[PDB]
């Protein structure tokens with residue numbers, strides 16, 4: 589199925605490649621001479637999973653309390669004929685009552701944005717019902733992959749959610765405080 | 768299906784984002800003060816499509832006549848919460864009887880390497896027969912997407928092939944000489 593191939597691709601072509609190297613990049617950042625006067629960037633990759641597939645490119649276009657802080661040092665790898673392909677990650681400050689409450693590596697699961705754009709193209713033969721059905725199935729398959737994964741050694745956190753006011757900052761802060 | 772979701776993802780999350788900007792990057796390279804004493808890098812992205820899903824990370828581990836020349840200038844975009852995500856492409860020299868015959872932007876279609884790794888993981892429930900079946904279906908769906916695509920304005924060339932001696936350099940040189 590669509591969700592099946594996408595969840596396995598997200599694992600094989602992304603998470604299994606960057607999760608083993610993520611602890612070191614966050615250590616390199618937290619130990620850099622310019623970040624000591626700020627709260628430490630929490631470990632783990634926080635992956636936003638909106639089941640509606642509403643994936644904006646800017647995280648401050650989802651909540652004002654999610655302000656971009658910096659980029660982690662880049663990861664490079666020779667990938668399918670591409671010499672030094674780049675894997676980049678962004679650090680975000682989380683606000684609670686106008687004050688810094690958490691610092692973390694945060695992004696959206698990129699295949700969710702693909703499922704959305706797919707349902708918009710007539711040639712894809714993919715409905716809005718198919719989009720909701722496949723979004724849930726992608727989140728499930730990902731969880732099942734990670735549950736038996738040796739790359740997931742407490743290196744990432746899946747944040748699945750539905751919008752009916754909603755606070756994305758609160759939803760993330762809730763996962764970060766669980767540690 | 769698996770191939771369907773992957774072909775649409777490869778289009779939506781990659782080709783429709785980089786093909787409109789590719790002519791300018793190749794012009795910036797070909798017009799740079801350091802490349803004038805060398806043959807011009809041909810236009811179009813050449814995408815290698817091995818139907819066996821044999822995708823090595825190094826292109827010189829597929830043919831000795833395919834030597835890495837340089838990288839094109841990088842493309843950046845804000846992508847699903849990632850500020851300035853990087854899209855990189857590699858330029859290759861093609862040899863014919865130990866001499867430079869062509870210069871082009873060349874890579875493998877990365878989802879083909881995913882279909883291979885998927886069939887290797889028992890948890891994927893994906894066979895070697897499923898892999899051959901989905902590889903052909905990915906190449907077909909991609910061709911049908913591109914046939915009605917306004918991003919494909921003669922900006923890329925699909926090179927599908929099967930291995931039974933074989934020359935990858937010759938197969939690429941044949942597509943490049945067609946222009």
Ligand SMILES: Nc1nc2c(ncn2[C@@H]2O[C@@H]3CO[P@@]([O-])(=S)O[C@H]4[C@H](F)[C@H](n5cnc6c(N)ncnc65)O[C@@H]4CO[P@@]([O-])(=S)O[C@@H]2[C@@H]3F)c(=O)[nH]1
Pocket residue numbers: 594597598599600601602603670673674675676695698699702776777778779780781849853854855877878881
């Ligand atoms: N967040 C994030 N996701 C990331 C990255 N690279 C990947 N993925 C994701 O992991 C899952 C397999 O990723 P792959 O790379 S096997 O699947 C990509 C395939 F490579 C092609 N493509 C995307 N980016 C590039 C690129 N720079 N050079 C060459 N091909 C590219 O489009 C597909 C959909 O890509 P997106 O971005 S919609 O999602 C993929 C896919 F869901 C990355 O750097 N960051």
